[PDB]
Assembly symmetry: C2
């Protein structure tokens, strides 16, 4: 029963191949490729062969996820790895799989089937996903993204997951500066501390 983003067991331009989220693509079995393409086509309202931010805001996603302008921009920042303002099919496959994983995890953690997680339920769920933050940070993420809501509905969960993932992208961008010395092996306990610190900047 594995949801850890750093441990995804296997079941393309350099921009897609050299991202931290590339292993998501390797969890997609052949039969799912065409199903994801049908989903892509649904979201691509102007049939351009690419997803634009407006289309992200109007799309339906796994589990009925929908995206605020802010979360859609996060999804762009994570998955638009050639920085062209468009999501290609390959970038979308990873975005899709990320959403699917996050949705499945939400459902598993919604044990009373309320359609929400309580704020104290957020930490262990994020830990399953590979984000090793502290309790203070977990409760702050709920306040930051819940828009005043008492609990964490699925869309709020995805907003939170998107911020965590975008912070992972920011980490890779920061640390590929050779000023900081050779790239160290990715360590999720150390990255968790980074996410703790960076989250506090949004408050």
């Amino acid at each position: 029963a594995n949801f850890c983003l750093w441990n995804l067991q296997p079941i393309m331009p350099p921009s897609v191949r050299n991202t931290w989220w590339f292993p998501l693509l390797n969890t997609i079995p052949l039969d799912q490729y065409t199903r994801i393409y049908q989903w892509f086509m649904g979201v691509d309202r102007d049939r351009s062969g690419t997803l634009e931010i407006n289309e992200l805001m109007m799309g339906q996603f796994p589990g009925g996820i929908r995206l605020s302008p802010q979360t859609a921009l996060r999804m762009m920042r994570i998955f638009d790895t050639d920085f062209n303002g468009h999501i290609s099919f390959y970038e979308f496959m990873a975005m899709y799989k990320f959403m699917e994983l996050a949705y499945n995890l939400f459902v598993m953690n919604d044990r009373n089937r309320s359609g929400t997680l309580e704020p104290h339920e957020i930490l262990p769920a994020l830990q399953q996903l590979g984000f090793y933050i502290n309790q203070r940070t977990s409760l702050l993420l709920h306040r930051l993204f819940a828009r005043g809501m008492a609990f964490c509905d699925l869309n709020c969960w995805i907003a939170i997951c998107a911020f965590a993932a975008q912070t992972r992208s920011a980490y890779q961008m920061i640390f590929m500066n050779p000023y900081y010395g050779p790239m160290k092996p990715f360590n999720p306990m150390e990255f968790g501390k980074f996410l703790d610190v960076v989250t506090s900047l949004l408050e």
Copy 2:
């Protein structure tokens, strides 16, 4: 005519002495100590001998600066370096001097005396202060903190400066983790790249 935070020419618990902003204290001449104390006393509405976040939100500061709940929390996060939820007189001396420097810089850059900077005027002013960000980042900082306002008034300038300074604190906290190797000399060009990346997370 120097405003660079990393180059402040000289004119205490370890928590105050070992902060990146400690050189601010060394720009305070003896005669200003008692004037800053009078200011401190004004803000300390309950005479506790310490400033609390509510008092920051109700205080008047150099140049008529006032603080939103969000900016007041930033000021706490920068200057409360023993993490006790209170601003001591020593922490306040640095906060005061930071505000004074930022206010003087705003005034110098408000060449038409409009009480505002245009968004394109923000970058060179931040560069004077020692924040070496790109133009994209400068315009984003205005959108993030201006609350819809077309231009950047003094309070919006301080909100922006506070975020930049708090990101400098986050940088020191991140990089004192020995996982990232020995602490490198502070390099403002490299830190500017870090601020570019981190700002994008707020959008």
